[PDB]
């Protein structure tokens with residue numbers, strides 16, 4: 001699904017989203033800029049921690065500055081964290097079963113959902129004494145893949161960090177609003193939390209099933225898993241953590257390789273089937 005949360009203070013944000021220990025099992029952080037806005041600022045590909053931090057403060061790479069220093073602290077809201085988590089079985093098959101094209105599938109699902117989120121981008125602009133929200137359609141995002149849950153179990157996820165900035169008629173303005181009122185961006189993202197989650201969730205299922213794997217619905221809002229995967233056995237030196245995960249995986253008796261060959265055969269079976 002997709003969880004929502006205030007982005008973590010511009011101060012510690014950088015190291016929080018990027019220190020190697022959040023993506024050790026994955027190998028790389030697979031981090032990247034996203035959004036029409038990032039493109040407008042010439043931000044593409046790998047993410048510079050310093051530029052990212054600055055972005056959270058309101059300092060953009062083109063000179064624009066939305067920071068608000070007040071008595072020693074910046075009062076510009078850093079932004080938001082939209083976290084897309086893959087289902088347990090997928091996380092396991094990806095980082096314990098070594099099937100990396102599932103990481104790609106996930107990445108493809110996040111890109112897809114995030115593009116929909118972007119259509120909600122907007123800002124408050126008052127004209128004629130009447131203020132109203134105006135769709136803006138551009139965001140500046142930095143995505144980071146992590147592989148570990150809060151309780152140290154495998155969890156492939158992407159923290160889609162949305163900077164609190166958007167361009168309007170050439171001016172960089174804030175998504176947040178210093179005044180309660182006519183529904184803004186993040187309120188609209190909440191009203192649609194299940195839907196964005198369903199978008200991601202359903203896009204992943206298409207990719208995943210394309211690779212040959214099977215899926216079965218196990219809960220509300222199309223929540224699904226891959227049949228047969230020991231999801232139950234999975235509810236700080238990452239090297240040790242991996243060691244344990246791999247061990248508890250063996251204790252289940254599950255045959256990873258056999259599971260994948262089955263997915264390969266099923267896949268080929270479908271491509272070579274006109275009747």
Ligand SMILES: [Mg+2]
Pocket residue numbers: 022146148157159
């Ligand atoms: Mg994380």
